[PDB]
Each structure stands twice: as C-alpha cells, then as structure tokens.
PDB file of all heavy atoms in Angstrom:
ATOM      1  N   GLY M   1      52.794 -25.376 143.154  1.00 23.71           N
ATOM      2  CA  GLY M   1      51.729 -24.560 143.706  1.00 23.71           C
ATOM      3  C   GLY M   1      50.366 -25.057 143.242  1.00 23.71           C
ATOM      4  O   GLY M   1      50.259 -26.128 142.634  1.00 23.71           O
ATOM      5  N   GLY M   2      49.333 -24.261 143.488  1.00 21.89           N
ATOM      6  CA  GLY M   2      48.004 -24.623 143.047  1.00 21.89           C
ATOM      7  C   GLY M   2      47.936 -24.486 141.538  1.00 21.89           C
ATOM      8  O   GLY M   2      47.194 -25.201 140.866  1.00 21.89           O
ATOM      9  N   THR M   3      48.704 -23.553 140.999  1.00 19.43           N
ATOM     10  CA  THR M   3      48.697 -23.308 139.550  1.00 19.43           C
ATOM     11  C   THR M   3      49.173 -24.536 138.808  1.00 19.43           C
ATOM     12  O   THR M   3      48.544 -24.983 137.847  1.00 19.43           O
ATOM     13  CB  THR M   3      49.566 -22.099 139.189  1.00 19.43           C
ATOM     14  OG1 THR M   3      49.014 -20.910 139.727  1.00 19.43           O
ATOM     15  CG2 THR M   3      49.710 -21.880 137.711  1.00 19.43           C
ATOM     16  N   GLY M   4      50.283 -25.091 139.271  1.00 20.43           N
ATOM     17  CA  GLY M   4      50.812 -26.287 138.641  1.00 20.43           C
ATOM     18  C   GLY M   4      49.852 -27.459 138.737  1.00 20.43           C
ATOM     19  O   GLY M   4      49.716 -28.228 137.791  1.00 20.43           O
ATOM     20  N   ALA M   5      49.177 -27.589 139.877  1.00 20.34           N
ATOM     21  CA  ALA M   5      48.214 -28.663 140.083  1.00 20.34           C
ATOM     22  C   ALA M   5      47.068 -28.554 139.064  1.00 20.34           C
ATOM     23  O   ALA M   5      46.650 -29.535 138.445  1.00 20.34           O
ATOM     24  CB  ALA M   5      47.667 -28.604 141.521  1.00 20.34           C
ATOM     25  N   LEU M   6      46.575 -27.337 138.892  1.00 22.69           N
ATOM     26  CA  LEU M   6      45.504 -27.084 137.942  1.00 22.69           C
ATOM     27  C   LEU M   6      45.946 -27.419 136.519  1.00 22.69           C
ATOM     28  O   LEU M   6      45.172 -27.963 135.724  1.00 22.69           O
ATOM     29  CB  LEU M   6      45.112 -25.607 138.015  1.00 22.69           C
ATOM     30  CG  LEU M   6      44.301 -25.174 139.236  1.00 22.69           C
ATOM     31  CD1 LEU M   6      44.179 -23.670 139.297  1.00 22.69           C
ATOM     32  CD2 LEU M   6      42.916 -25.796 139.207  1.00 22.69           C
ATOM     33  N   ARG M   7      47.190 -27.084 136.192  1.00 23.76           N
ATOM     34  CA  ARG M   7      47.713 -27.328 134.841  1.00 23.76           C
ATOM     35  C   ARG M   7      47.854 -28.820 134.531  1.00 23.76           C
ATOM     36  O   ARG M   7      47.431 -29.273 133.473  1.00 23.76           O
ATOM     37  CB  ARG M   7      49.037 -26.571 134.626  1.00 23.76           C
ATOM     38  CG  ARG M   7      49.692 -26.809 133.291  1.00 23.76           C
ATOM     39  CD  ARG M   7      48.781 -26.398 132.146  1.00 23.76           C
ATOM     40  NE  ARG M   7      49.402 -26.696 130.861  1.00 23.76           N
ATOM     41  CZ  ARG M   7      50.336 -25.941 130.290  1.00 23.76           C
ATOM     42  NH1 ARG M   7      50.627 -24.745 130.793  1.00 23.76           N
ATOM     43  NH2 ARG M   7      50.968 -26.374 129.202  1.00 23.76           N
ATOM     44  N   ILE M   8      48.418 -29.579 135.464  1.00 19.66           N
ATOM     45  CA  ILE M   8      48.570 -31.020 135.273  1.00 19.66           C
ATOM     46  C   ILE M   8      47.207 -31.689 135.115  1.00 19.66           C
ATOM     47  O   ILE M   8      47.033 -32.565 134.254  1.00 19.66           O
ATOM     48  CB  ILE M   8      49.264 -31.715 136.467  1.00 19.66           C
ATOM     49  CG1 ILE M   8      50.631 -31.104 136.731  1.00 19.66           C
ATOM     50  CG2 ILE M   8      49.429 -33.187 136.175  1.00 19.66           C
ATOM     51  CD1 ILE M   8      51.490 -31.006 135.520  1.00 19.66           C
ATOM     52  N   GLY M   9      46.249 -31.293 135.954  1.00 19.74           N
ATOM     53  CA  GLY M   9      44.927 -31.885 135.873  1.00 19.74           C
ATOM     54  C   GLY M   9      44.246 -31.579 134.556  1.00 19.74           C
ATOM     55  O   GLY M   9      43.636 -32.458 133.950  1.00 19.74           O
ATOM     56  N   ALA M  10      44.356 -30.335 134.103  1.00 19.27           N
ATOM     57  CA  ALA M  10      43.747 -29.942 132.837  1.00 19.27           C
ATOM     58  C   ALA M  10      44.395 -30.686 131.682  1.00 19.27           C
ATOM     59  O   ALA M  10      43.717 -31.148 130.770  1.00 19.27           O
ATOM     60  CB  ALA M  10      43.880 -28.478 132.642  1.00 19.27           C
ATOM     61  N   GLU M  11      45.716 -30.814 131.740  1.00 19.01           N
ATOM     62  CA  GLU M  11      46.465 -31.536 130.703  1.00 19.01           C
ATOM     63  C   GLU M  11      45.989 -32.991 130.630  1.00 19.01           C
ATOM     64  O   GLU M  11      45.817 -33.565 129.555  1.00 19.01           O
ATOM     65  CB  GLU M  11      47.960 -31.519 131.023  1.00 19.01           C
ATOM     66  CG  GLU M  11      48.679 -30.162 130.763  1.00 19.01           C
ATOM     67  CD  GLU M  11      48.650 -29.734 129.301  1.00 19.01           C
ATOM     68  OE1 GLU M  11      48.659 -30.623 128.424  1.00 19.01           O
ATOM     69  OE2 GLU M  11      48.642 -28.510 129.024  1.00 19.01           O
ATOM     70  N   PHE M  12      45.774 -33.586 131.793  1.00 16.16           N
ATOM     71  CA  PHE M  12      45.314 -34.962 131.846  1.00 16.16           C
ATOM     72  C   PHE M  12      43.918 -35.099 131.227  1.00 16.16           C
ATOM     73  O   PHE M  12      43.673 -35.983 130.405  1.00 16.16           O
ATOM     74  CB  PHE M  12      45.274 -35.464 133.287  1.00 16.16           C
ATOM     75  CG  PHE M  12      44.711 -36.844 133.412  1.00 16.16           C
ATOM     76  CD1 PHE M  12      45.540 -37.938 133.287  1.00 16.16           C
ATOM     77  CD2 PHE M  12      43.345 -37.050 133.592  1.00 16.16           C
ATOM     78  CE1 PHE M  12      45.038 -39.216 133.349  1.00 16.16           C
ATOM     79  CE2 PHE M  12      42.825 -38.327 133.645  1.00 16.16           C
ATOM     80  CZ  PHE M  12      43.667 -39.416 133.526  1.00 16.16           C
ATOM     81  N   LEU M  13      43.002 -34.246 131.667  1.00 18.66           N
ATOM     82  CA  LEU M  13      41.632 -34.301 131.199  1.00 18.66           C
ATOM     83  C   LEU M  13      41.528 -34.082 129.704  1.00 18.66           C
ATOM     84  O   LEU M  13      40.675 -34.674 129.050  1.00 18.66           O
ATOM     85  CB  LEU M  13      40.780 -33.277 131.946  1.00 18.66           C
ATOM     86  CG  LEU M  13      40.667 -33.517 133.462  1.00 18.66           C
ATOM     87  CD1 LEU M  13      39.994 -32.317 134.127  1.00 18.66           C
ATOM     88  CD2 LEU M  13      39.867 -34.769 133.714  1.00 18.66           C
ATOM     89  N   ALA M  14      42.385 -33.225 129.161  1.00 20.43           N
ATOM     90  CA  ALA M  14      42.347 -32.945 127.729  1.00 20.43           C
ATOM     91  C   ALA M  14      42.881 -34.112 126.890  1.00 20.43           C
ATOM     92  O   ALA M  14      42.761 -34.107 125.661  1.00 20.43           O
ATOM     93  CB  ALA M  14      43.100 -31.679 127.427  1.00 20.43           C
ATOM     94  N   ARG M  15      43.447 -35.123 127.543  1.00 22.24           N
ATOM     95  CA  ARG M  15      43.963 -36.291 126.814  1.00 22.24           C
ATOM     96  C   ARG M  15      43.158 -37.558 127.033  1.00 22.24           C
ATOM     97  O   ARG M  15      43.007 -38.350 126.111  1.00 22.24           O
ATOM     98  CB  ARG M  15      45.413 -36.582 127.201  1.00 22.24           C
ATOM     99  CG  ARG M  15      46.384 -35.476 126.900  1.00 22.24           C
ATOM    100  CD  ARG M  15      47.786 -35.888 127.308  1.00 22.24           C
ATOM    101  NE  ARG M  15      48.803 -35.056 126.671  1.00 22.24           N
ATOM    102  CZ  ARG M  15      49.001 -33.776 126.950  1.00 22.24           C
ATOM    103  NH1 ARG M  15      48.316 -33.189 127.917  1.00 22.24           N
ATOM    104  NH2 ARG M  15      49.877 -33.077 126.243  1.00 22.24           N
ATOM    105  N   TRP M  16      42.729 -37.797 128.266  1.00 25.35           N
ATOM    106  CA  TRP M  16      42.049 -39.045 128.596  1.00 25.35           C
ATOM    107  C   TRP M  16      40.619 -38.975 129.131  1.00 25.35           C
ATOM    108  O   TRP M  16      40.036 -40.010 129.437  1.00 25.35           O
ATOM    109  CB  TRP M  16      42.883 -39.782 129.638  1.00 25.35           C
ATOM    110  CG  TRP M  16      44.289 -40.015 129.220  1.00 25.35           C
ATOM    111  CD1 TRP M  16      45.403 -39.403 129.718  1.00 25.35           C
ATOM    112  CD2 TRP M  16      44.742 -40.905 128.200  1.00 25.35           C
ATOM    113  NE1 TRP M  16      46.525 -39.875 129.081  1.00 25.35           N
ATOM    114  CE2 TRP M  16      46.147 -40.806 128.149  1.00 25.35           C
ATOM    115  CE3 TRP M  16      44.096 -41.792 127.331  1.00 25.35           C
ATOM    116  CZ2 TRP M  16      46.920 -41.560 127.262  1.00 25.35           C
ATOM    117  CZ3 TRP M  16      44.863 -42.535 126.445  1.00 25.35           C
ATOM    118  CH2 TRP M  16      46.258 -42.419 126.422  1.00 25.35           C
ATOM    119  N   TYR M  17      40.072 -37.778 129.285  1.00 27.49           N
ATOM    120  CA  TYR M  17      38.728 -37.635 129.835  1.00 27.49           C
ATOM    121  C   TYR M  17      37.651 -37.498 128.772  1.00 27.49           C
ATOM    122  O   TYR M  17      37.821 -36.780 127.796  1.00 27.49           O
ATOM    123  CB  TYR M  17      38.647 -36.423 130.779  1.00 27.49           C
ATOM    124  CG  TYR M  17      37.266 -36.168 131.361  1.00 27.49           C
ATOM    125  CD1 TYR M  17      36.761 -36.935 132.406  1.00 27.49           C
ATOM    126  CD2 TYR M  17      36.465 -35.147 130.859  1.00 27.49           C
ATOM    127  CE1 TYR M  17      35.496 -36.681 132.930  1.00 27.49           C
ATOM    128  CE2 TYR M  17      35.207 -34.896 131.379  1.00 27.49           C
ATOM    129  CZ  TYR M  17      34.735 -35.666 132.412  1.00 27.49           C
ATOM    130  OH  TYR M  17      33.490 -35.426 132.931  1.00 27.49           O
ATOM    131  N   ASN M  18      36.519 -38.157 129.002  1.00 29.22           N
ATOM    132  CA  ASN M  18      35.387 -38.068 128.097  1.00 29.22           C
ATOM    133  C   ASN M  18      35.813 -38.470 126.677  1.00 29.22           C
ATOM    134  O   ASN M  18      35.450 -37.818 125.693  1.00 29.22           O
ATOM    135  CB  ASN M  18      34.842 -36.639 128.157  1.00 29.22           C
ATOM    136  CG  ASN M  18      33.473 -36.503 127.550  1.00 29.22           C
ATOM    137  OD1 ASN M  18      32.645 -37.411 127.640  1.00 29.22           O
ATOM    138  ND2 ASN M  18      33.206 -35.344 126.965  1.00 29.22           N
ATOM    139  N   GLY M  19      36.608 -39.538 126.596  1.00 30.17           N
ATOM    140  CA  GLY M  19      37.117 -40.007 125.328  1.00 30.17           C
ATOM    141  C   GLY M  19      38.609 -39.728 125.247  1.00 30.17           C
ATOM    142  O   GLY M  19      39.202 -39.257 126.215  1.00 30.17           O
ATOM    143  N   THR M  20      39.221 -40.010 124.102  1.00 29.28           N
ATOM    144  CA  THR M  20      40.642 -39.774 123.919  1.00 29.28           C
ATOM    145  C   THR M  20      40.934 -38.454 123.202  1.00 29.28           C
ATOM    146  O   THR M  20      40.466 -38.216 122.088  1.00 29.28           O
ATOM    147  CB  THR M  20      41.255 -40.950 123.163  1.00 29.28           C
ATOM    148  OG1 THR M  20      41.105 -42.138 123.913  1.00 29.28           O
ATOM    149  CG2 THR M  20      42.711 -40.797 122.856  1.00 29.28           C
ATOM    150  N   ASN M  21      41.731 -37.610 123.854  1.00 32.32           N
ATOM    151  CA  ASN M  21      42.141 -36.313 123.306  1.00 32.32           C
ATOM    152  C   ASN M  21      40.962 -35.439 122.882  1.00 32.32           C
ATOM    153  O   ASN M  21      40.970 -34.830 121.815  1.00 32.32           O
ATOM    154  CB  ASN M  21      43.111 -36.504 122.132  1.00 32.32           C
ATOM    155  CG  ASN M  21      44.346 -37.314 122.506  1.00 32.32           C
ATOM    156  OD1 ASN M  21      44.943 -37.115 123.561  1.00 32.32           O
ATOM    157  ND2 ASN M  21      44.757 -38.205 121.611  1.00 32.32           N
ATOM    158  N   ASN M  22      39.953 -35.384 123.738  1.00 35.11           N
ATOM    159  CA  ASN M  22      38.763 -34.602 123.488  1.00 35.11           C
ATOM    160  C   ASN M  22      38.936 -33.182 124.033  1.00 35.11           C
ATOM    161  O   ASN M  22      38.813 -32.963 125.233  1.00 35.11           O
ATOM    162  CB  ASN M  22      37.565 -35.269 124.166  1.00 35.11           C
ATOM    163  CG  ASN M  22      36.254 -34.570 123.861  1.00 35.11           C
ATOM    164  OD1 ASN M  22      36.227 -33.537 123.191  1.00 35.11           O
ATOM    165  ND2 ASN M  22      35.157 -35.125 124.367  1.00 35.11           N
ATOM    166  N   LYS M  23      39.211 -32.219 123.159  1.00 36.18           N
ATOM    167  CA  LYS M  23      39.381 -30.837 123.588  1.00 36.18           C
ATOM    168  C   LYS M  23      38.062 -30.082 123.510  1.00 36.18           C
ATOM    169  O   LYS M  23      38.029 -28.869 123.736  1.00 36.18           O
ATOM    170  CB  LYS M  23      40.406 -30.130 122.705  1.00 36.18           C
ATOM    171  CG  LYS M  23      41.781 -30.784 122.683  1.00 36.18           C
ATOM    172  CD  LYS M  23      42.550 -30.502 123.943  1.00 36.18           C
ATOM    173  CE  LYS M  23      43.997 -30.966 123.827  1.00 36.18           C
ATOM    174  NZ  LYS M  23      44.077 -32.446 123.786  1.00 36.18           N
ATOM    175  N   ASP M  24      36.983 -30.780 123.157  1.00 32.08           N
ATOM    176  CA  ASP M  24      35.682 -30.138 123.009  1.00 32.08           C
ATOM    177  C   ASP M  24      34.791 -30.105 124.253  1.00 32.08           C
ATOM    178  O   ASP M  24      33.833 -29.345 124.309  1.00 32.08           O
ATOM    179  CB  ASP M  24      34.957 -30.770 121.832  1.00 32.08           C
ATOM    180  CG  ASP M  24      35.732 -30.619 120.550  1.00 32.08           C
ATOM    181  OD1 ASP M  24      36.052 -29.462 120.200  1.00 32.08           O
ATOM    182  OD2 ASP M  24      36.045 -31.644 119.905  1.00 32.08           O
ATOM    183  N   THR M  25      35.105 -30.923 125.249  1.00 33.48           N
ATOM    184  CA  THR M  25      34.310 -30.947 126.476  1.00 33.48           C
ATOM    185  C   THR M  25      34.221 -29.551 127.091  1.00 33.48           C
ATOM    186  O   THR M  25      35.239 -28.914 127.330  1.00 33.48           O
ATOM    187  CB  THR M  25      34.928 -31.903 127.501  1.00 33.48           C
ATOM    188  OG1 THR M  25      35.145 -33.177 126.931  1.00 33.48           O
ATOM    189  CG2 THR M  25      34.047 -32.101 128.740  1.00 33.48           C
ATOM    190  N   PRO M  26      33.004 -29.053 127.350  1.00 30.73           N
ATOM    191  CA  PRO M  26      32.923 -27.713 127.947  1.00 30.73           C
ATOM    192  C   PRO M  26      33.545 -27.665 129.341  1.00 30.73           C
ATOM    193  O   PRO M  26      33.377 -28.585 130.153  1.00 30.73           O
ATOM    194  CB  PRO M  26      31.407 -27.468 128.061  1.00 30.73           C
ATOM    195  CG  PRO M  26      30.795 -28.415 127.115  1.00 30.73           C
ATOM    196  CD  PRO M  26      31.670 -29.628 127.125  1.00 30.73           C
ATOM    197  N   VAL M  27      34.215 -26.556 129.617  1.00 28.26           N
ATOM    198  CA  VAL M  27      34.822 -26.317 130.925  1.00 28.26           C
ATOM    199  C   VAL M  27      34.112 -25.087 131.459  1.00 28.26           C
ATOM    200  O   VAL M  27      34.005 -24.088 130.758  1.00 28.26           O
ATOM    201  CB  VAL M  27      36.336 -26.029 130.834  1.00 28.26           C
ATOM    202  CG1 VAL M  27      36.891 -25.559 132.163  1.00 28.26           C
ATOM    203  CG2 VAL M  27      37.085 -27.240 130.402  1.00 28.26           C
ATOM    204  N   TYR M  28      33.611 -25.167 132.683  1.00 26.27           N
ATOM    205  CA  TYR M  28      32.885 -24.053 133.276  1.00 26.27           C
ATOM    206  C   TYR M  28      33.620 -23.456 134.459  1.00 26.27           C
ATOM    207  O   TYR M  28      34.047 -24.175 135.356  1.00 26.27           O
ATOM    208  CB  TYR M  28      31.523 -24.505 133.781  1.00 26.27           C
ATOM    209  CG  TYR M  28      30.452 -24.757 132.735  1.00 26.27           C
ATOM    210  CD1 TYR M  28      30.424 -25.934 132.004  1.00 26.27           C
ATOM    211  CD2 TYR M  28      29.429 -23.838 132.537  1.00 26.27           C
ATOM    212  CE1 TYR M  28      29.395 -26.196 131.099  1.00 26.27           C
ATOM    213  CE2 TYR M  28      28.402 -24.078 131.629  1.00 26.27           C
ATOM    214  CZ  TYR M  28      28.386 -25.261 130.917  1.00 26.27           C
ATOM    215  OH  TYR M  28      27.349 -25.503 130.039  1.00 26.27           O
ATOM    216  N   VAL M  29      33.705 -22.132 134.470  1.00 26.76           N
ATOM    217  CA  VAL M  29      34.331 -21.387 135.563  1.00 26.76           C
ATOM    218  C   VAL M  29      33.297 -20.406 136.112  1.00 26.76           C
ATOM    219  O   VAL M  29      32.338 -20.044 135.417  1.00 26.76           O
ATOM    220  CB  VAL M  29      35.587 -20.604 135.088  1.00 26.76           C
ATOM    221  CG1 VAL M  29      36.621 -21.558 134.541  1.00 26.76           C
ATOM    222  CG2 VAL M  29      35.224 -19.615 134.023  1.00 26.76           C
ATOM    223  N   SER M  30      33.460 -19.989 137.358  1.00 25.19           N
ATOM    224  CA  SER M  30      32.498 -19.079 137.950  1.00 25.19           C
ATOM    225  C   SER M  30      32.617 -17.693 137.334  1.00 25.19           C
ATOM    226  O   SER M  30      33.676 -17.297 136.833  1.00 25.19           O
ATOM    227  CB  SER M  30      32.689 -18.988 139.463  1.00 25.19           C
ATOM    228  OG  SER M  30      33.895 -18.315 139.783  1.00 25.19           O
TER     229      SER M  30
END
C-alpha cells in the first residue's frame, strides 16, 4: 500500500540520504 511505500522510502533516507545513517535531517509534515 501507500503505507509500505512511505516506510521503505523513509528507511532508505535514514541510511543513505544527506550522509550515512543520518537520523538528524529534519522531516517536515503539513
């Protein structure tokens, strides 16, 4: 579903985005 898609993407970003394993990047929601 969309939920799973969101989870995989977030998991990916928390490991390889904006550096390696960077859990500090701000995430903004409406």
Side-chain angles (χ1 to χ4, degrees):
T3 294
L6 286 171
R7 177 59 183 281
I8 303 309
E11 285 298 328
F12 176 87
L13 297 171
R15 299 181 162 69
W16 305 109
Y17 178 77
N18 195 35
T20 298
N21 303 317
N22 185 356
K23 302 284 189 291
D24 301 304
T25 308
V27 170
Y28 285 80
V29 300
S30 70

